Amino acid sequence: HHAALRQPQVAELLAEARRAFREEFGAEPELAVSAPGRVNLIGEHTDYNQGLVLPMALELMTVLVGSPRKDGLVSLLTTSEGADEPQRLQFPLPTAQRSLEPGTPRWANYVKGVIQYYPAAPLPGFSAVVVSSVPLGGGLSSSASLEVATYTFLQQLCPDSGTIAARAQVCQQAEHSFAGMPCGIMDQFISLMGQKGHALLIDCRSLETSLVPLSDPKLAVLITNSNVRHASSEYPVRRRQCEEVARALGKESLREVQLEELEAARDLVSKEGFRRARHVVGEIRRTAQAAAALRRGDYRAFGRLMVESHRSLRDDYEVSCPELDQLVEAALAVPGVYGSRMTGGGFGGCTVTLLEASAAPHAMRHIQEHYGGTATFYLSQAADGAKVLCL
Amino acid sequence: AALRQPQVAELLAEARRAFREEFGAEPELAVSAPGRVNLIGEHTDYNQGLVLPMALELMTVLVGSPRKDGLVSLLTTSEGADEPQRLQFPLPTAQRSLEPGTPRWANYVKGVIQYYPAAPLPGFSAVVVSSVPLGGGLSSSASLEVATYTFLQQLCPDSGTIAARAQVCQQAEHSFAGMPCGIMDQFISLMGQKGHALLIDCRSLETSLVPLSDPKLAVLITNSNVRHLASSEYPVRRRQCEEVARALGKESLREVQLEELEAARDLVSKEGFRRARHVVGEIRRTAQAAAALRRGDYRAFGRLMVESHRSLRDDYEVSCPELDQLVEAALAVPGVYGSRMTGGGFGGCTVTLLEASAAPHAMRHIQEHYGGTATFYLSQAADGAKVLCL
Ligand SMILES: Nc1ncnc2c1ncn2[C@@H]1O[C@H](COP(=O)(O)OP(=O)(O)NP(=O)(O)O)[C@@H](O)[C@H]1O
Ligand SMILES: Nc1ncnc2c1ncn2[C@@H]1O[C@H](COP(=O)(O)OP(=O)(O)NP(=O)(O)O)[C@@H](O)[C@H]1O
Ligand SMILES: OC[C@H]1O[C@H](O)[C@H](O)[C@@H](O)[C@H]1O
Ligand SMILES: OC[C@H]1O[C@H](O)[C@H](O)[C@@H](O)[C@H]1O
Ligand SMILES: [Mg+2]
Ligand SMILES: [Mg+2]
């Protein structure tokens, strides 16, 4: 039991949501939903390049609990300390006249989005409490967890018609338009599409999806939070950076580009952009590779891809951080460790590490002790997707 | 006009009802397990082939409660079931080992019990409800086992893999129901995911999600409401297949190629040549159709479904007149891409792929030309087993 080891329980989480709600609203909540977060095993920054990704859902998740309102108002609360002040917010529904605006608190930017876009209708007013086990800004998609969780609740409010992909699309837009973060599709999907003891190999181009099992009692998924959070002014930049490269190469995406082919436009694309593209191109393949290694059970070959991945992300994409790099280094230092890399967005957050379960504990100390920061550890297993919880 | 399929809600309540009724109290636990339609890849599961199923919105509901009492008492709501509809009995033990007898419908549950991996296991009161036709070729068997199982994990949670739970139910059907089944049924039952068909490799146990999210496309399930079970034939086919493979020093028919199949002609019987030919043929087709589908070639997709049927009717001999009548009828409706029997065969259902615009004509058309009473279902890809909260 590391002391830095967190085992948040959903039963718990609900109970919390039940309490604050009861306390904040004076009564028992009517509805209960929850959207999990996700860790990317490999495939960073391909998302928005129509690349492959191989995330997996966690037990860390966002629980929303609440009730409709005759009232006609939107009124929320966030039990999260990681959020932006104030922790509460109330606002009136949009109308054909008045349409919600991304304001302050920024946290609320997420909810509003999912509200402003929700497909169906008519949408009531609601009382809502937001509980979460997903560290804010930790590389584990607290973003998507939040959005989805919101959307799924709304579904309880006003049932929709559409596909799952649509849902992801919704939440995505809301992030794009409301939170100002041109993200990709990954996060939402896996938040929706998740499944037990299984990893998802998703095709960002096609949206095709495949399940790679993760049910080994001898394999272990260790996530370490650096607890640092630097360069989000950066994301959209890389995005642009690629977009532009792909442009030069007369290609729709960098997905249609090949390691070998990039060296063609060497003189047709900026240095920087060369590097970015390179990472992306190799990363995508590296991803198709690691799923194969995994299905096959080549945890070694998998621990290696991961490392490569890290490095690309450090050197060519430039989205890591000394902390990350440190955390990785330390991990790699333990015996029983297949590989380790930074997960998610980059510029701080978490790392993900594959190892021998029995090594888990040693890893926890080595790391702690060699990480010149406050480290948080999660011994993760692939979880299920967005789901309604009946009170 | 399509039969309208109870929504869990409905099914639940009904479950509630008879339970409160039959046990004098309000249920503690509830869980549901869907049924299934196989788009293709028939009779390929116990040959380590490929199948293409999707879960149904027809499922089984199980609302029950524990028993300090130490026993197992159940009751099914389905009329198509075995008499008696009520079946009390004593939990298994070291010395006591469940004995599959009567009613036969009980056999299923016993197995899922006898094998539940975990312990300790309490006693129970459970009501069984289902919108799935018993013997409709939609897996009323795997939808049950599953729910049971899904129940028992509530009574004494499980640690193992999904594939592990599947194996249980399977062993139960196998050892207890007397049905040597393959893997498909159970898997999809658990594995199912809303708006997705499932390409399962019953060799690698590997599976991939295929998006069935297109309004303009419909999956029509037509019930012949006929049952000949020539169940007797099933274990039979399993054999031939197996024999052959043997002759060919092959682990599984999955190891053989249509093309290599010539070789054995002299090596194997004539009939057994046809069976393999179906299997071996069913696997490539399944493989191709999935691509077709992915690809969005509904047209090709259907072409493959029709071939499957012929194969199924002529080489494997698992069709039935009513089945061939229904398919033939379907194929004649414009908008229809393909149709074919589904499930084990010898009765039950047909699955049709067409243009959602066509559903109504079809339904009419099939009824007209059907010298029996068909029941229809307009299927939508559903999710797997879930835990129901009361
Ligand atoms: N439970 C929550 N309560 C309030 N706000 C939250 C909650 N979860 C997330 N947020 C909001 O969402 C933001 C997360 O932004 P983001 O940069 O995407 O982090 P992340 O998704 O967790 N990391 P990554 O998955 O790598 O992108 C926070 O800064 C909040 O504004
Ligand atoms: N809810 C239920 N209650 C009682 N018995 C049931 C129930 N569901 C299934 N069964 C039992 O399981 C049997 C299922 O028949 P089965 O031979 O498995 O065909 P099927 O599963 O409906 N179709 P197929 O997918 O082709 O196997 C029924 O005849 C019953 O004996
Ligand atoms: O892969 C990096 C990651 O960055 C953020 O988490 C985005 O939301 C994701 O879509 C993805 O781009
Ligand atoms: O594809 C035919 C089908 O026959 C029965 O339904 C079996 O339970 C399945 O495993 C499969 O063999
Ligand atoms: Mg995010
Ligand atoms: Mg069956």
- Catalytic annotation on A160? no
The CB of A83 under 6 Å from ligand 1? The reply is yes
Based on the fold, state whether residues B151 and B253 are members of the same structural domain.
Answer: no
Nearest to A14 by CA among A131, A126, A127: A131
Contact A307, A341 (CB under 8 A): yes
Q: Which of A65, A192, A206, A209 to mutate to test the interface with B (most CBs of B within 10 A)?
A: A209
Length of chain A measured in residues: 391
The two tokens of residue A277 are 């593209």
The atom of ligand 4 lying closest to the CA of B137 is: 6
Distance CA B35, CA B147 (A): 10
- What DSSP line would sit under A179-230, residue for residue? S-----SHHHHHHHH--TTEEEEEETTT--EEEEE---SSEEEEEEEEEEE-
Q: Which residues contact A323 (CB under 8 A, 6 or more apart)?
A: A226, A228, A348, A371, A373
Are the Cβ atoms of A165 and B294 closer than 8 angstroms?
no
Q: What sign does the CA torsion over A385, A386, A387, A391 have?
A: positive
The atom of ligand 2 lying closest to the CA of B128 is: 1
Q: What is the whole-number distance in angstroms between the Cα of residue B33 and the centre of ligand 6?
A: 13
- What DSSP line would sit under B61-81, residue for residue? EEEEEEETT-EEEEEE--TTS
Distance CA A115, CA B385 (A): 30
Please name the residue that has the structure tokens 């995994």.
A294
Distance CA A319, CA A327 (A): 15
Distance CA B201, CA B208 (A): 9
CB-closest option in B161, B163, B294 to A208: B294
* 3 state DSSP class of A352: strand
Q: Which residues contact A133 (CB under 8 A, 6 or more apart)?
A: A6, A8, A13, A37, A59, A60, A61, A62
Quick one: B271 exposed, middle or buried, by C-beta within 10 A (0-12, 13-18, 19+)?
A: exposed
CB-closest option in B161, B207, B390 to A211: B207
Contact A224, A208 (CB under 8 A): no
Q: Which of A65, A203, A208, A214 to mutate to test the interface with B (most CBs of B within 10 A)?
A: A208
Based on the fold, state whether residues B171 and B41 are members of the same structural domain.
Answer: yes
Nearest to A52 by CA among A235, A293, A281, A249: A281
Nearest to A167 by CA among A214, A236, A120: A120
CA distances from A277 to A265, A306, A328, B56, B369 (A): 11, 18, 23, 44, 61
The two tokens of residue B80 are 């198509």
CB-closest option in A165, A215, A295 to B161: A215
Which residues does residue B12 pair with via DSSP β-bridges, in sequence order? Answer: none
Based on the fold, state whether residues A133 and A4 are members of the same structural domain.
Answer: yes
Neighbour-count burial for A92-124, b at 16+ CB within 10 Å, e otherwise: ebeeeeeebebeeeebbbbbbbbbbbbbeeebb
Q: Which helix (H) or strand (E) holds A61?
A: strand A52-69
Based on the fold, state whether residues A208 and A281 are members of the same structural domain.
Answer: no
CATH code for position A136: 3.30.230.10
CATH code for position B314: 3.30.70.890
Q: What sign does the CA torsion over B268, B270, B271, B276 have?
A: positive
Q: Which of the residues B69, B82, B185, B214 is marked catalytic?
A: B185
CA distances from A79 to A228, B143, B279 (A): 21, 40, 58
Based on the fold, state whether residues A41 and A19 are members of the same structural domain.
Answer: yes
Q: Which ligand is nearest to the CA of B60?
A: 2
Distance CA B330, CA B350 (A): 9
Contact A307, A354 (CB under 8 A): no
Contacting residues of B for A213, CB less than 8 Å apart: 161, 163
Instruction: Identify residues whose C-beta is under 5 A from ligand 6, the ion.
Output: B 139, 141
Q: Which amino acid is at A389?
A: L
The two tokens of residue A128 are 């809502």
Please name the residue that has the structure tokens 């945890």.
A299
Terminal CA-to-CA distance of chain A, rounded, Å? 31
- How was this entry determined? X-ray
Nearest to B208 by CA among B86, B346, B51, B5: B51
Based on the fold, state whether residues B297 and B194 are members of the same structural domain.
Answer: no
Based on the fold, state whether residues A294 and A376 are members of the same structural domain.
Answer: yes
* Test site for ligand 2: of B60, B108, B138, B141, most ligand atoms within 8 A of the Cβ: B141
Contact B248, B254 (CB under 8 A): no
Distance CA A11, CA B141 (A): 32
Distance CA B81, CA B105 (A): 7
Based on the fold, state whether residues A303 and A240 are members of the same structural domain.
Answer: yes
Distance CA B40, CA B93 (A): 41
Distance CA A346, CA A318 (A): 9
Measure the CA dihedral A195/A391/B33/A208, to 10°. Answer: -30
SS (H, E, C) B34-58: EEEEEEECCCCHHHCCEEEEEEEEE
* Test site for ligand 4: of B185, B283, B305, most ligand atoms within 8 A of the Cβ: B185
Phi-psi category of residue A175: left, alpha or beta, with phi > 0 → left and psi -120 to 50 → alpha: alpha
CB-closest option in A165, A193, A215 to B213: A165
Q: What sign does the CA torsion over B271, B272, B278, B281 have?
A: negative
The two tokens of residue B260 are 């290599």
Are the Cβ atoms of B213 and A163 closer than 8 angstroms?
yes
Based on the fold, state whether residues B11 and B133 are members of the same structural domain.
Answer: yes
Based on the fold, state whether residues A346 and A313 are members of the same structural domain.
Answer: yes
Backbone angles phi, psi at B42, to 5 degrees: -90, 135
Contacting residues of B for A390, CB less than 8 Å apart: 388-390
Distance CA A249, CA A243 (A): 10
Are the Cβ atoms of B206 and A164 closer than 8 angstroms?
no
Based on the fold, state whether residues B102 and B245 are members of the same structural domain.
Answer: no
CA distances from B271 to A82, B243, B244 (A): 70, 12, 10
Resolution (A): 2.5
Contact residues, chain B to chain A, C-beta under 8 Å: 161-163, 193-195, 204, 206-211, 213, 294, 388-390
Minimal CA separation from B251 to chain A, in Å: 20
Domain limits for position A31 = 1-213+382-391
- Give the β-pairing of B71-76 and B123-130: parallel
Q: What is the whole-number distance in angstroms between the Cα of residue A314 and the centre of ligand 5?
A: 19
Are the Cβ atoms of A207 and B209 closer than 8 angstroms?
no
How many Cα neighbours within 13 Å face the side chain of B7?
A: 1
Q: Which amino acid is at A43?
A: G
What radius of gyration, in Å, describes the C-alpha atoms of chain A? 21
How many Cα neighbours within 13 Å face the side chain of B160?
A: 15
If one counts the domains in chain B, the total is 2
Distance CA A94, CA A74 (A): 10
Q: How far is CA B129 from the centre of its chain?
A: 16
Based on the fold, state whether residues B234 and B321 are members of the same structural domain.
Answer: yes
- Give the β-pairing of A31-42 and A52-69: antiparallel
Binding site as annotated, residues of B:
36, 42-43, 45, 135, 137, 139-140, 185, 234
Degrees, nearest 5: CA angle B168-B171-B176: 120
Q: What is the whole-number distance in angstroms between the Cα of residue B347 and the centre of ligand 5?
A: 52
Distance CA B309, CA B369 (A): 19
